[PDB]
Every structure is written in structure tokens, then in C-alpha cells.
Design an enzyme around this catalytic site. Structure first.
Site, short mmCIF file in Angstrom:
data_model
loop_
_atom_site.label_atom_id
_atom_site.label_comp_id
_atom_site.label_asym_id
_atom_site.label_seq_id
_atom_site.Cartn_x
_atom_site.Cartn_y
_atom_site.Cartn_z
CB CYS A 75 39.72 91.14 -72.17
SG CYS A 75 39.51 90.03 -70.68
CB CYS A 157 37.63 91.47 -68.60
SG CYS A 157 39.20 90.81 -68.86
#
Length: 252
Positions: A75, A157
């Protein structure tokens, strides 16, 4: 016929074969996607648009394909792009420093392809397909990129990067898919920073395109989602790729 139903290019010739050879190829290379049944993928893809009116596609129509092509990608290594994909792809192929959506299965299947079906038939239309602008926005291709890109953005993320086309008058364009979908699906709980890399086009001594108004607008839109902003100029993309390949202190 001398006049097509729709205004946009028709389904890419040999589309189903291409999608199919893409998948087999993808899932041979990527050990995470080995459990994928490529005939199932194609059937789910087909099922999204075959025998459906090509102006009434929904994101639900793509759910089965999305479910089969479920993939975790690191991520914290996501590279977004807007308008300027070729450098982004050339960059990720150097040593997988990051992952663009075209480095996921679904993205890799669909890159550069067009495709649509017709309502009264269960064939594929190689003659013409709806143009997002002249025809309708709810067409098979646009709804695909919208649905898969929304999910990709939602999984990001930490520091997410984005490459932008600094040769445009709108370096960040609110009305592009990045501007209208991806950027509004980066999650405030996960994404720490969006760092844009503004890829110059024209010669030598360019501006610091990071102080561009549209870049200021991006910064301010994302702040007001609680995400930090960073930006870098890439003055010479040629020498940038070369530094990426041979980071050897040439003068990198």
C-alpha cells in the site's frame, strides 16, 4: 456500414484473445495471482458489458471481475499518474520501486484497450463504442477505470506519489480521472502525504512548476482531507530514468 452507431473507437480487434493472453501472462509472472483462473476472469469481464446497453453500465456490472482480480499491492508504494502514463510505466519497470494501477492484474488487462457490447445482442461491437464526451459517461471502459481506480486509491497508505504532465496548461486537472476520482478516494486515515512529481516537457531552464496555481489547488484540496503535500520537479525525464537505472552518482 458507412456510419457508426457511436462516436468513439470500436472494441480493439482481437480483444478477447488479448485480454486472455494478458491474464495468462500476468498470473505466470506474479506468484500472488497464481490462484487466478484466466477463463473465469474473461467470463467475468465479458459478463460486465456483453448484452448490456453500453450507456447503462454500472460499477455493479464489474463486481464479479473486481472480485476475481482482488489483489493486495504494497500500500505504501503506489504511483498514480494523470495524463502522463508512459514515463510512469517506464519508471516502475526499472526496479519495481513502485506500482501503478497498470501493474495490478485488472489494470494490466485493460491498458490501451477499448471495448463495448450492444443491447439487443450478445456480441462485441468492433465497429464503434461510446465516447465519454459525445455519447455517455456510463460506458464499459469509463466505468471500468472509474471502479478499479477508486479501489486502487482506497487501498493506498503512507506516501502516495503522483506523476503529472507539466507541459499541460493544467498540470493538475480537477476534471481528469485522477482529479475527480483518485484524489477523492485517498483515505485520510491511511494516507500521510501525496507527493507529486511534475514532469517537464520543454527545453532546459523551466520554471519551478511546483508553484503553479493548479498545483497549489491540488495541495489545498488534499490538505482539506488531512493529507500532507510535497512536490518535486522532474526537469529532465531522460536523465531521471537514467539515474533510476544507474543511480551510480553519475550526477544523480
Amino acid at each position: 456500414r458507412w456510419r457508426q452507431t457511436w462516436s468513439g473507437p470500436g472494441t480493439t480487434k482481437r480483444f478477447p484473445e488479448t485480454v486472455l493472453a494478458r491474464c495468462v501472462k500476468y498470473t505466470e509472472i506474479h506468484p500472488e495471482m497464481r490462484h487466478v483462473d484466466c477463463q473465469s476472469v474473461w467470463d467475468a469481464f465479458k459478463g460486465a458489458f456483453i448484452s448490456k446497453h453500453p450507456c447503462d453500465i454500472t460499477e455493479e456490472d464489474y463486481q464479479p471481475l473486481m472480485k476475481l482480480g482482488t489483489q493486495t499491492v504494497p500500500c505504501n508504494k503506489i504511483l498514480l499518474w494523470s495524463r502522463i502514463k508512459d514515463l510512469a510505466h517506464q519508471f516502475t519497470q526499472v526496479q519495481r520501486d513502485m506500482f501503478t494501477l497498470e501493474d495490478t492484474l485488472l489494470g494490466y488487462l485493460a491498458d490501451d484497450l477499448t471495448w463495448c457490447g450492444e443491447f439487443d445482442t450478445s456480441k462485441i461491437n468492433y465497429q464503434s463504442c461510446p465516447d465519454w464526451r459525445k455519447d455517455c459517461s456510463n460506458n464499459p471502459v469509463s466505468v471500468f477505470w472509474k471502479t478499479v481506480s477508486r479501489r486502487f486509491a482506497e487501498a493506498a497508505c503512507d506516501v502516495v506519489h503522483v506523476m503529472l504532465d507539466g507541459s499541460r496548461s493544467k498540470i493538475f486537472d480537477k476534471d481528469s480521472t485522477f482529479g475527480s476520482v483518485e484524489v477523492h478516494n485517498l483515505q485520510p486515515e491511511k494516507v500521510q502525504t501525496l507527493e507529486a512529481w511534475v514532469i517537464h516537457g520543454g527545453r532546459e531552464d523551466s520554471r519551478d512548476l511546483c508553484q503553479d496555481p493548479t498545483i497549489k489547488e491540488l495541495e489545498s484540496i488534499i490538505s482539506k482531507r488531512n493529507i500532507q503535500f510535497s512536490c518535486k520537479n522532474i526537469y529532465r525525464p531522460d536523465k531521471f530514468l537514467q539515474c533510476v537505472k544507474n543511480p551510480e552518482d553519475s550526477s544523480c
